[PDB]
Amino acid sequence: GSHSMRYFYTSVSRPGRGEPRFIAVGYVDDTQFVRFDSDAASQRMEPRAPWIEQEGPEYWDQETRNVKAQSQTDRVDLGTLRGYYNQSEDGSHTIQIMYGCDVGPDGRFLRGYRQDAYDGKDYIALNEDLRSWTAADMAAQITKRKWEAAHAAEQQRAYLEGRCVEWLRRYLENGKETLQRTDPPKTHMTHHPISDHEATLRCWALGFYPAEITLTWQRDGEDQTQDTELVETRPAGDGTFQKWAAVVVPSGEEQRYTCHVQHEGLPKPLTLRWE
Template structure:
């Protein structure tokens, strides 16, 4: 049995030949839009098949992404390719047969993956083993700020380990484990599969990425500036670590480095990488170990599409504890004085009111008293 039988029927081919939807003349304009954004963009598809499905774990799942935003999803339970964002629904409305065709392709992939999992278990001598075995496929492309292809990948994994990958440079398949050599040999001698996938990654994938960016431009081409913070942590050896923290920025591409007296100190820094947030934005951090006496010479330089020019962030000493204590004491004293004044005014007012109501006769007597007139001189 041949592992990874390719394109036995047209609908069972990879969802790469999108000739059912003509490319519009807006591709050039979209390329210009992406070029002006200053950031890279990507389109990737992830397929996952499992040998033993369970609750919440379909036997086959396929999800498409533009940048880090899921755009469509198919699984073996729903049996349909379904849009995941509103602008993909709009895309489907403009292309009525799109979702039907994509669903048929995913169903073909589901059938192939079941056969391939059986074949792989034989290759790895796991016919009688228990537990879940997985087959994964990832393929897609990334374009740079100029809209040109920066990276294209087509690779398989089995049980979480690399299995087979396309080398675009040599137009051959790279076997990551001995069990993949049979597949590599067959694909390179019996088919033109490597050529086909290379052509897809360098042409069709880039073109369709531009179309999707056009429909999703309000979210995918937006910019959100990072919220910045510089923090400090004391070490045990007399040194200190400065942290440059950035939150809530979009797009993902960002340039961050620590500078000392204007000199790039990238080689001395550590970073946690760029991590997505639940709201679609990103965060990252960068740290560097410094001599406490020299921390004023360091600045964190940040470059991002949302910024008209790079930011230079420095550590700022917070107010001293003594100053904070003085401020608190002064605040308490002022509050106490205001309270005393308020109570005094209130009590005087109350006493005045009581005196007015308690002596009404006095007021009348004053009005009826005999006035002494001063005689004319």
């Protein structure tokens, strides 16, 4: 199938309490492999997955230096944006950046990304063409202009279409036994009477990968999506994910309910019934 590499940067200012906290994490699909944290003792880009550990010292010194150059850029960017929105010097603000590339089953480049946010909302984003930008407001318009005069997009595109996919393919090869796999979900149902007239039916999905999944409750074949409660997919901590969907059914009608699970792993959509 297709694969992706994605990095996430978060810079949180903290006036008076020192320089802003910078955190970066790298991912290949749904598996993290590196991380940098300014509030950590190492002050180095560190490994978060066994397979990235085969990279020599020069790799780590490079990532550290280049990711530190990034904290430097974000540190001052935090200041100018504060200006753009005429915000006080004592407030805490955050800049988030996400960027990466997707490749298909043959390792070919499909698309690249680069999107930035300020205080939890979109600020500016590189368009699919990797040649133009989309500013969310008048402030980002100031940045859009500066970024055009500097031909910033060209630099981004060169990376997204070059080293981004080159290294994405490399990681997929170096950690093939762990990255190129799909763990189908293990499923079971639970039952909780809410009263003598109602009961909760919860459908579970455990130890699956990738994280993307679909859980649905049907009654007599009829889709019940609206009375169904779903929790956010969550990580088990071992590289697999979990998730459940629940539904409140009249005491005595549970036999009519069916849970359907859809995942890239399982050859065919599963179907669970109470009893």
